[PDB]
């Protein structure tokens, strides 16, 4: 009862005495579609084994996300190294306005309406990781009010 999507597949090489050893790297994102989300990449000499290994790693690199029932609770700006990502909540019916790597994470995490933009390098793994960092650092009004020791009415 879990949703999986393969974001990118790359062909990498290693040099040896004989020549080049070609292997495959697959990055996948798994999620329930209800707030649980995770990503992982696998390497193997075959694409199906790389994909299965990426899925296995994604199933263990999981976090929980509290969404605003369709979207985010506040604008988020995140980064991982040189990919800078920005997401802001949008009105219902807007859709996921995102590139491939952002769209994978958001759609599999269950976001339906969000505005996004990638700055810096658009490396698929680093963009996925920056989006993942932002979703894991995102806060809720209840959590902010509890942290400050107030109520959600006391903290608009």
């Amino acid at each position: 009862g879990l949703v999986e999507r393969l974001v990118t597949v790359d062909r990498v090489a290693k040099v040896v005495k004989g020549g080049r050893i070609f292997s495959f790297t697959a990055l996948t994102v798994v999620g329930d579609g209800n707030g649980r989300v995770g990503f992982g990449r696998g390497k193997a000499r075959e694409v199906p084994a790389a994909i299965q290994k990426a899925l296995e790693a994604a199933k263990r690199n999981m976090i929980t996300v509290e969404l605003n029932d369709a979207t985010l609770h506040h604008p988020i700006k995140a980064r991982h190294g040189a990919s800078k990502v920005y997401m802001q909540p949008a009105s219902e019916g807007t859709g996921v306005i995102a590139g491939g790597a952002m769209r994978a994470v958001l759609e599999v995490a269950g976001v339906k309406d969000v505005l996004t933009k990638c700055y810096g390098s658009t490396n698929t793994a680093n963009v996925v990781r920056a989006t993942f960092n932002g979703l894991r650092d995102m806060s809720t009004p209840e959590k902010m009010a509890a942290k400050r020791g107030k109520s959600v009415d006391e903290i608009l």
Partner: protein, 131 residues
């Protein structure tokens, strides 16, 4: 030398919270006490007291808060700096974290939160964003 007193105050708070210090102390001022009192009444710091030292001097000491071992003050950034001051009207005060945070506003009625200034229908200098 030091030409941003408010920036220094917020930088001291930020570094102390990153280092997980119990409290942060500095030389005091009425502006610093106003900002610290706003932080206290917003719930970002536990308390802020002034102790009168000798030679007509004063020390402002702020007791920080931690929630689940993490600092309560997630981010505290200066918006209006001495090199570029930012004054906004009542309908241009920027919100912090979709209203979860506080934009500290210096208005003619004193230091108060962005939502307090909006309710009073008054603008001012947007000095910092704390969330």
């Amino acid at each position: 030398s030091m030409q941003d007193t408010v920036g220094d105050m917020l930088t001291r708070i930020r570094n102390a919270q990153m280092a997980n210090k119990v409290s942060v102390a500095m030389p005091s001022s009425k502006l610093r006490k106003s900002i610290a009192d706003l932080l206290v009444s917003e719930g970002y710091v536990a308390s802020a007291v002034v102790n009168a030292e000798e030679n007509n001097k004063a020390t402002l000491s702020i007791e920080l808060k931690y929630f689940e071992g993490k600092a309560v003050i997630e981010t505290i950034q200066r918006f209006s700096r001495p090199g570029l001051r930012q004054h906004r009207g009542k309908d241009a005060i920027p919100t912090v974290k979709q209203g979860m945070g506080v934009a500290i506003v210096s208005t003619s009625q004193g230091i108060m939160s962005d939502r307090a200034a909006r309710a009073a229908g008054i603008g001012g200098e947007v000095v910092a964003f704390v969330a």
